[PDB]
């Protein structure tokens, strides 16, 4: 493609980063979290809290950004410091947040009384600092709700003559703003909008997920220092406050639609495979929202598969299944033409969506089950395992996870919620499995490393304030793996595709009869008495190795017997993870295959393990694996 395009992407995703960034840097300073911080140099998150009487859970999302930022670090004893990054909380104008609030629909049309010459020329003078970063973040601030409201009135479709619509003052700002952002020139004649110009055009609804926040982020303070219920409350009628879920759903589809092409291959693949009469006959879509993805999926097998060839015979028939009427509406009618049924049901209840689809006469076995970006939308249910909990505690979890109270809910607790949460579905999942689609968060390091590259340090953070529940993609692919769902190879994708996170899975889960977990100090006396590629490992170096990467160990489980085991270790600024012992039980039923299973296992897990660029061992372990008597394992 085109060269000044590195810039401009890094240019719009800044943008979307300063207009949550920004709320979150004005209130901690309004209320004195950096002068605290500079009162008393080492304090954990727990003093914060209580000595500025702020809300852990919130407060928790705003330090993981600003340490994404680089305004702050957190010690070994996870005690925060600050760093000179964070002097630029200064150099901010608090009055920025107006624009939270101020009607751009009004401005444009001229019936407004005040404009934003101001910031049009603030941004001219690139917000007086000469930090980039910075000066994109707060232009972020004024450009997402005006480029917006611009193409919601078309004064931009129009490149030729742009603006003449306008009074002569309105044109006179917007022009002088375009032509210093270098978004528009005029050489002859008129004005005309360039190509960074039009790139910004182009992408405009992407920012509208993060636009749609707004009511949220102006209440920054109310979160982080308040009741922040008064944030979320919902009427009598029940509309949502906290965000403009209208512009959310439709810029949100727009987004969604790019990932449910990547069903398409799987869904060919289930529906090529013979024979015919033993494929689902039902596709069961949990959120199904307007039955976009169920029409997809419908058309693909008619036009790809072998099952499209004869549906005369063999019928399909869709289900959308929604908690909301309305939705069950916009989907029956979007499926027109094409065998289907709604209806109601909760992410949360798949043993009620069992129940009515036996009311409905539909054959459990012939289900298969699909969802997408729904499972860290779920309402939070508390674990009710509290002794595995309590296992789970001493794991490095760096889950955010905010409750009802903006408390914080303990990293473990929430992936032991997810884990129960999948458990459920796991009971109902059947030979045809689970296609599933789920966006993810990172951690603060990965975040602080690809901060151009990456939409993380928004996204993650408006998911945590509005207490949805993101976590880490090998933190989900190990919740899944626990309760015995694996996603399979052949139909796996991970977004963005080459760099060292992941923020997208697309996954095809199927049940097996076995679970993977973390190993964790309490397998140590099984683990010796594995058969074992290296001599024997003695059990100081176990507890090395478990104490320096607590989840990067993972076993194999069948009938609460261990079958196998894989230690790894992470090096080299935690880019490179690198197989470091195998361990097999060959008194186990076809421990050979599951052998082979956890090392296919540990390539996916560490494929969207935050930060890993490359994997070594690969080979050395297959073969080890793979030529089991040849290779000479210990104690076998
Ligand atoms: N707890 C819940 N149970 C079932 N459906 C839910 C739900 N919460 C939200 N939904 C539904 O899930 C949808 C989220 S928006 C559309 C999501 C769709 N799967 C897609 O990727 O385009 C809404 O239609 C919403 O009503
Ligand atoms: C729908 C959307 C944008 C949100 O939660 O606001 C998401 O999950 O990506
Ligand atoms: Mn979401």
């Known amino acids: 493609n085109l060269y000044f395009q590195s810039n401009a992407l890094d240019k719009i995703n ?17 209320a004195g979290v950096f ?13 914060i809290v209580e000595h500025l009487a702020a809300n852990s859970g919130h407060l928790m999302v705003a330090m993981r950004l600003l340490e994404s930022l680089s305004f702050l670090y957190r010690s070994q004893a996870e005690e925060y410091i600050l760093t000179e990054q964070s002097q630029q909380h200064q150099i901010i104008p608090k009055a920025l947040m107006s624009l939270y609030k101020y009607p751009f629909e009004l401005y444009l049309k001229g019936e407004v009384e005040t404009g934003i010459s101001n910031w ?14 910075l000066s994109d973040l707060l232009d972020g601030v004024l450009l997402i709700p005006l480029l917006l409201e611009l193409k919601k009135q078309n004064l931009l479709d129009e490149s030729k003559k742009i603006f003449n619509t306008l009074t002569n003052s309105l044109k006179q700002e917007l022009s002088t703003l375009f032509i210093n952002l270098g978004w528009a020139e005029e050489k002859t004649e008129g004005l005309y909008l360039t190509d960074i110009g039009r790139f910004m055009r182009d992408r405009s609804l992407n920012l509208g997920t993060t636009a ?59 529906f090529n495979q013979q024979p015919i009469e033993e ?8 959120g199904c929202g307007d039955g976009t993805l169920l029409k997809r999926i419908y058309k693909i097998i008619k036009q790809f598969s072998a099952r499209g060839k004869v549906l005369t015979e063999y019928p399909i028939i869709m289900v959308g299944v929604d908690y ?32 009515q689809l036996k009311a409905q006469g539909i054959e459990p076995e012939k289900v298969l089950h699909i969802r997408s970006f729904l499972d860290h939308d779920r309402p939070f ?16 979890y760096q889950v955010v996870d905010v409750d009802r109270e903006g408390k914080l809910i303990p990293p473990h607790i929430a992936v032991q919620s997810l884990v129960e949460h999948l458990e459920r579905w796991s009971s109902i999942i059947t030979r045809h499995g689970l296609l599933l689609l789920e966006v993810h968060s990172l951690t603060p390091a990965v975040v602080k490393k690809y901060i151009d590259e990456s939409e993380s340090l928004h996204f993650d953070a408006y998911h945590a304030f509005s207490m949805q529940h993101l976590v880490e993609a090998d933190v989900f692919l190990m919740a899944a793996a626990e309760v015995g769902l694996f996603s399979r190879k052949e139909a796996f994708r991970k977004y963005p595709k080459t760099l060292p996170l992941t923020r997208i899975t697309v996954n095809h889960f199927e049940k097996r009869k076995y679970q993977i977990r973390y190993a964790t100090v309490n397998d140590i006396p099984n683990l010796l008495k594995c058969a074992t590629f290296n001599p024997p490992v003695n059990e100081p170096f176990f507890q090395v190795l478990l104490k320096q990467t607590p989840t990067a160990h993972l076993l194999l489980e069948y009938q609460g017997e261990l079958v196998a085991a894989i230690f790894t270790e992470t090096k080299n600024s935690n ?55 040849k290779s000479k394992w210990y104690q076998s």
């Not at 001219?124 to 970063?133: G, I, V």
């Not at 494929?279 to 949990?286: F, S």
């Not at 050979?592 to 490359?614: N, R, S």
């Open 324 to 355: 909301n009427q309305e939705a069950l509406d916009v989907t029956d009618k979007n499926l027109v033409d094409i065998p289907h049924l709604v209806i109601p049901g909760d992410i949360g209840a798949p043993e009620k969506l069992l129940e």
């Open 120 to 133: 049009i020329n603030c941004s001219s003078r690139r917000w007086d600092t000469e930090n980039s970063l």
């Open 14 to 30: 800044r943008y979307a980063h300063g207009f949550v960034a920004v709320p979150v840097i004005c209130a901690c300073s309004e």
């Open 35 to 47: 002068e605290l911080l500079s009162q008393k140099k080492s304090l954990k998150l727990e003093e």
């Open 212 to 270: 749609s926040y707004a009511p949220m982020l102006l209440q920054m303070k109310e979160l982080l220092f308040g009741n922040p219920q008064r944030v979320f409350q919902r009427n009598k009628t029940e509309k949502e406050r906290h965000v403009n879920r209208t512009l959310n759903v439709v810029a949100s589809g727009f987004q969604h639609e790019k990932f449910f092409a990547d069903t398409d291959k799987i869904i060919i693949s289930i």
């Open 381 to 396: 249910i508390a674990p009710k395992n509290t002794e595995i909990a309590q296992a789970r505690s001493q794991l490095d």
């Open 279 to 286: 494929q689902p006959i039902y596709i069961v879509d949990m």
């Open 575 to 629: 880019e490179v993870l690198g197989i470091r012992e195998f361990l097999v039980r060959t008194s186990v039923e076809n421990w050979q295959v599951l052998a082979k299973d956890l090392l296919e296992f540990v390539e996916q897990w560490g494929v969207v393990k935050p930060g890993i660029k490359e994997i070594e061992g690969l080979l050395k372990y297959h073969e080890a694996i793979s030529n089991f008597q």
